[PDB]
């Protein structure tokens, strides 16, 4: 799965708990899992 301090690494069903998603900086550089949602 795509963990919180880890690069976006498939085959993965998003992150290990369902409210976090992969968040890049520059094309594919610095892509780490992020809890953006307030409820889910």
mmCIF file of C-alpha atoms in Angstrom:
data_model
loop_
_atom_site.group_PDB
_atom_site.id
_atom_site.type_symbol
_atom_site.label_atom_id
_atom_site.label_comp_id
_atom_site.label_asym_id
_atom_site.label_seq_id
_atom_site.Cartn_x
_atom_site.Cartn_y
_atom_site.Cartn_z
ATOM 1 C CA UNK A 1 0.000 0.000 0.000
ATOM 2 C CA UNK A 2 1.127 3.746 -0.359
ATOM 3 C CA UNK A 3 2.264 4.548 3.298
ATOM 4 C CA UNK A 4 2.592 8.116 4.917
ATOM 5 C CA UNK A 5 6.502 8.437 4.692
ATOM 6 C CA UNK A 6 6.981 6.339 1.454
ATOM 7 C CA UNK A 7 7.121 6.952 -2.402
ATOM 8 C CA UNK A 8 3.901 6.099 -4.479
ATOM 9 C CA UNK A 9 4.614 2.345 -5.179
ATOM 10 C CA UNK A 10 1.990 0.106 -7.166
ATOM 11 C CA UNK A 11 0.234 -2.452 -7.266
ATOM 12 C CA UNK A 12 -1.530 -0.588 -4.349
ATOM 13 C CA UNK A 13 -5.321 0.065 -3.342
ATOM 14 C CA UNK A 14 -4.530 3.772 -2.437
ATOM 15 C CA UNK A 15 -3.042 3.896 1.203
ATOM 16 C CA UNK A 16 -3.339 1.314 4.150
ATOM 17 C CA UNK A 17 -6.305 3.210 5.882
ATOM 18 C CA UNK A 18 -9.063 4.605 3.380
ATOM 19 C CA UNK A 19 -9.015 8.503 3.962
ATOM 20 C CA UNK A 20 -5.304 9.152 2.766
ATOM 21 C CA UNK A 21 -4.078 9.678 -0.927
ATOM 22 C CA UNK A 22 -0.735 10.171 -2.925
ATOM 23 C CA UNK A 23 0.413 13.904 -3.006
ATOM 24 C CA UNK A 24 3.226 15.000 -5.478
ATOM 25 C CA UNK A 25 5.358 18.232 -5.675
ATOM 26 C CA UNK A 26 6.949 18.411 -9.252
ATOM 27 C CA UNK A 27 5.674 15.874 -11.976
ATOM 28 C CA UNK A 28 6.695 12.643 -9.999
ATOM 29 C CA UNK A 29 9.262 14.167 -7.395
ATOM 30 C CA UNK A 30 8.346 14.074 -3.593
ATOM 31 C CA UNK A 31 5.092 11.934 -3.823
ATOM 32 C CA UNK A 32 3.981 10.867 -0.231
ATOM 33 C CA UNK A 33 0.553 9.794 1.364
ATOM 34 C CA UNK A 34 -1.604 12.716 2.740
ATOM 35 C CA UNK A 35 -4.886 12.885 4.848
ATOM 36 C CA UNK A 36 -6.588 15.785 2.870
ATOM 37 C CA UNK A 37 -10.269 14.817 3.814
ATOM 38 C CA UNK A 38 -12.130 16.190 6.934
ATOM 39 C CA UNK A 39 -14.774 13.323 7.395
ATOM 40 C CA UNK A 40 -13.588 10.645 4.786
#
